[PDB]
Amino acid sequence: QAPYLSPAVPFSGTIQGGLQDGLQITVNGTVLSSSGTRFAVNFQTGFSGNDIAFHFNPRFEDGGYVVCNTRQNGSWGPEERKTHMPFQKGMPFDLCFLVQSSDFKVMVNGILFVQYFHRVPFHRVDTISVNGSVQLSYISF
Ligand SMILES: CC(=O)N[C@@H]1[C@@H](O)[C@H](O[C@@H]2O[C@H](CO)[C@H](O)[C@H](O[C@@H]3O[C@H](CO)[C@@H](O[C@@H]4O[C@H](CO)[C@H](O)[C@H](O)[C@H]4O)[C@H](O)[C@H]3NC(C)=O)[C@H]2O)[C@@H](CO)O[C@H]1O
User: Subunit info?
Assistant: First the structure.
């Protein structure tokens, strides 16, 4: 599938034929230096945002942490927080999401940062959305 180039934020877009084992999604952009304190990459089913299989949510708050979570039928589940901020405000980033059968792995700037085990079946998620304090250069597959 062709990449989305300079998509405006907030973004959503379709992942052609859905998430698959071994699919790698790159999100390349810049964290804004002073336009808020959080951003999110969401892997979801459709365009509603009520069923987000994997919400990856860096927060430049309390010194900085990343929330990983799942929204199901409009309900957020138990957060998995990573008390490690691998981003810097104002700086470019390259995020890579590797879909595996049991989990997502998230590489930040080349290096595995977090592992999130599937809470809902992944082959059904077909949409990426991005919101918050970021500018995007591209999303590639
Ligand atoms: C200590 C503790 O338990 N803390 C809890 C808080 O962390 C918690 O905050 C919520 O946490 C969830 C993850 O658990 C999300 O980060 C929530 O933020 C919301 O995220 C959604 C999805 O990204 C976002 O909606 C999207 O917005 C875009 C455009 O911007 C568009 O409208 C899409 O349609 C939509 O999906 C939403 O805006 C965002 N809201 C905020 C305020 O960030 C986060 O609130 C709270 C509440 O559960 O509970 C604490 O106790």
Answer: Monomer.
Kindly list the domain boundaries of the chain, sorted by start residue: 1-141
Long-range residue pairs from 67-71, CB within 8 A, at least 24 positions apart, any chain: 68/114, 68/116, 70/119, 70/120, 71/44
Residue 105 alpha carbon to ligand 1 centre in Å? 21
Method: X-ray
Q: How far apart are CA 85 and CA 12, in angstroms?
A: 25
Pair 59, 129: CB distance under 8 Å: no
**1-141 in CATH: which number?**
2.60.120.200
Residues in the annotated binding site for a beta-D-galactoside: 42, 55, 59, 69, 76-82
Report whether 28 contacts 94 (CB < 8 A).
yes
